[PDB]
Design a protein around this nucleic acid. Sequence first.
DNA 1: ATGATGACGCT
DNA 2: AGCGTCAT
Length: 426
Amino acid sequence: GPHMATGQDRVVALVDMDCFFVQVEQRQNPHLRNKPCAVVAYKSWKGGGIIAVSYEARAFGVTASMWADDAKKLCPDLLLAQVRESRGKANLTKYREASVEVMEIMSRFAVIERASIDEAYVDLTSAVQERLQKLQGQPISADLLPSTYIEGLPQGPTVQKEGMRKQGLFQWLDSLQIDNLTSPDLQLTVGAVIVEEMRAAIERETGFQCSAGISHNKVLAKLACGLNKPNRQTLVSHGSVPQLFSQMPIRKIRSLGGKLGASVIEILGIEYMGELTQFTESQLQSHFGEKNGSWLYAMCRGIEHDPVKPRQLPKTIGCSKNFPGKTALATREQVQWWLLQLAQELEERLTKDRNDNDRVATQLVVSIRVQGDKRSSLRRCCALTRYDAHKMSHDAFTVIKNCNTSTEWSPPLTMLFLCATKFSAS
DNA sequence: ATGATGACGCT
DNA sequence: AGCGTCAT
Ligand SMILES: Nc1ccn([C@H]2C[C@H](O)[C@@H](COP(=O)(O)OP(=O)(O)OP(=O)(O)O)O2)c(=O)n1
Ligand SMILES: [Ca+2]
Ligand SMILES: [Ca+2]
């Protein structure tokens, strides 16, 4: 139990666009539609680096971080769109703008947290209560959930994918107690009805398809989203967690895909998320720190309290370019010229941002990488007082020039990064 | 060695 | 403040 919390207090969705940069290019160029295709940055080196891949091309084994020339070996008919190039660098404006299209539609339904260029979390708790006030006690038909998967179902007593989806959904809805407006499962179900609507509106008004996850917190909603991609949505109930987590590799859960997840596996000698339940909160805290330990203890039971933050715009605006291998900047003149190119794109994006969103950045963060992967090697800041490219590139040079151990610059820089931050209204 | 981003934690 | 981790 009567005093044990179960993490069923919210309805949270994570919406993520399907092969996003590819859809943006396919909307614009109908020849690319329903074909194996990919988006590449640059062209000179091995046909360019693949940044995004349609599902038709994934069926040939093509992935991101492949060189286009190598992708062609797996998929000879592969079609390519390339990222716009401005001032000698890749420019993502087209995708940032398509992103705004989608975010503004989602923001009509509820408060969103912009999680990336093509993903947003939604807290649907209030919206769900609303929809439950209307539809006073009346059944939810499977027709309101035409693309929803219920994770863990069907169980017990078809041969095709859509057959299985529906069988599971029928089992789910048949068991659903609609007379209790406090039922966590009913609330998730209504949550999923709203997300069907949201996803319909996105596709109607933009042409873009997406997937979604619906559950009681962000981590489960994110996990749920990727269970049935593309163009589908997945409901992960509290009750589904023990079986789902029982064979779920630790690295699949958000924030456990890197070093901490590896420590968890190595120190505890476990593989799957469910196995974490057999450790006390104190043991987990002793191994991984108080915050991580408490987080892990709750999370392996499907419980997480990270709030959906009310934030629709990025908190930073940055411009970055890598200079790998022989292309690494070796002279002072090069460093200054590329700082200028970056500052000019940055100035362009800052002026737009100020006009649109009534805010101004006050700090300029300058970050470089040295040949050989020193320490980002180095990060320094200065005041951003004027949206002026020549001043910003000059200031950035001023704060990094001391790092030169040499007309010549050594060690060669393999990356430059300018980032505007610490925004104030207006 | 996708190269281009973005959010947040630690000290 | 500057570096590290984790992710799209
Ligand atoms: N390391 C990465 C990962 C992604 N992206 C870009 C290209 C993607 O189209 C977009 C969204 O990334 P996702 O990881 O969501 O991948 P997609 O949306 O392309 O595919 P999926 O349908 O698997 O989400 O961000 C990128 O530039 N660099
Ligand atoms: Ca995506
Ligand atoms: Ca994404």
